[PDB]
Amino acid sequence: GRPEWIWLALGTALMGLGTLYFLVKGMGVSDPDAKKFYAITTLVPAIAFTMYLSMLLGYGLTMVPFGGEQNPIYWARYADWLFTTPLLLLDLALLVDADQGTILALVGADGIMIGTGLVGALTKVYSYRFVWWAISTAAMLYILYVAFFGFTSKAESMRPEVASTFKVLRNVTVVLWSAYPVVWLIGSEGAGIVPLNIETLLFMVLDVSAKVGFGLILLRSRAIFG
């Protein structure tokens, strides 16, 4: 009965219901282009649902000694993010017809971001936790830079309605993704200022917005149709 369980339960509900709704809508669509966006976007909260559910049931949690104490760390978050973050970037790349080499570079950077974040989260020497955090944050900023400058440039060649939908999704992505390193820094994995229950609340609001919110915006747009 960990106090953060309530937010894990609410995250589970929200991701579950989001997945179900996207699946129902997606299965009804016949346009092949729209179907690809549905397939990618439905998978995102589906993966998050399984990881939130696992954490709700007491899995994906480990104790890491640092700063003279035994600290609880939810590593299952990284398993979710390893797969869902590149899927979200793929949605954006597909909207703007980004180059294959750009997608490869972003997916590589994304793997670095999640992998070094996880190594950070598991590191037993307090100061070194922040070296890995800094490397992960640098990878994230490379991603946001490309999604902001590179993808907008590509969007300028698309019809205005596709460009408009892209810009809303780009803006949501920049605002939400840039919060994650700060929550990590001040929370359980970092400085230990924000207690685990509140941190779990914060990550739940961010996760639901970045996956279900993002998905609602994308999947209700005419932009996904070919």
Ligand X SMILES: *C/C=C(C)/C=C/C=C(C)/C=C/C1=C(C)CCCC1(C)C
Ligand Y SMILES: C[C@H](CCC(=O)NCCC[N+](C)(C)CCCS(=O)(=O)[O-])[C@H]1CC[C@H]2[C@@H]3[C@H](O)C[C@@H]4C[C@H](O)CC[C@]4(C)[C@H]3C[C@H](O)[C@]12C
Distance CA 6, CA 39 (A): 29
The encoded tokens of residue 53 equal: 């559910």
Please tell me whether residue 107 binds ligand D12 under the rule CB under 6 A. no
Binds ligand Y (CB under 6 A): choice among 57, 104, 174, 175: 57
Site residues for ligand X, 71-130, by CB under 6 A, read 81, 84-85, 88, 113-114, 117
How far apart are CB 5 and ligand Y at their closest, in Å?
4
Please tell me whether residue 119 binds ligand D10 under the rule CB under 6 A. no
Partner interacting with residue 1 (select from ligand D10, ligand Y, ligand R16, none; CB below 5-8 Å by kind): ligand Y
Please tell me whether residue 144 binds ligand R16 under the rule CB under 6 A. yes
Partner interacting with residue 101 (select from ligand X, ligand Y, ligand D12, none; CB below 5-8 Å by kind): ligand D12
Q: Are residues 207 and 18 in contact, defined by beta-carbon separation less than 8 angstroms?
A: no
Residues touching ligand R16, count (CB under 6 A): 5
Site residues for ligand Y, 3-32, by CB under 6 A, read 5
Listed ranges 27-35, 95-103, 135-143, 145-153: which one lies at the site for ligand X (CB under 6 A): 135-143
In DSSP terms, 69 is beta-bridged to 66
Please tell me whether residue 131 binds ligand D10 under the rule CB under 6 A. yes
Q: How far is CA 65 from the centre of its chain?
A: 27
- Specify whether the backbone of 207 is left (phi greater than 0), alpha (psi in -120 to 50) or beta: alpha
How far apart are CB 189 and ligand Y at their closest, in Å?
21
**C-alpha distances in Å from residue 3, one per residue of 11, 77, 154, 201:** 14, 17, 45, 11
Q: Are residues 77 and 103 in contact, defined by beta-carbon separation less than 8 angstroms?
A: no
Q: Which is nearer to ligand D10, 87 or 134 (CB)?
A: 134
Nearest to 51 by CA among 208, 219, 216, 221: 208
**C-alpha distances in Å from residue 35, one per residue of 24, 90, 205:** 12, 14, 27
Q: Are residues 125 and 66 in contact, defined by beta-carbon separation less than 8 angstroms?
A: yes
Residue 3, CB-side half-sphere exposure with 13 Å CA sphere: 7
Partner interacting with residue 58 (select from ligand Y, ligand X, ligand D12, none; CB below 5-8 Å by kind): ligand Y
Helix, coil or strand: residue 225 = coil
Please tell me whether residue 202 binds ligand D10 under the rule CB under 6 A. no
Chain residues in the site for ligand X (CB under 6 A):
81, 84-85, 88, 113-114, 117, 133, 136-137, 140, 177, 180-181, 184, 207, 210-211
Chain residues in the site for ligand D12 (CB under 6 A):
101-102, 105, 109, 112, 134, 138-139, 142
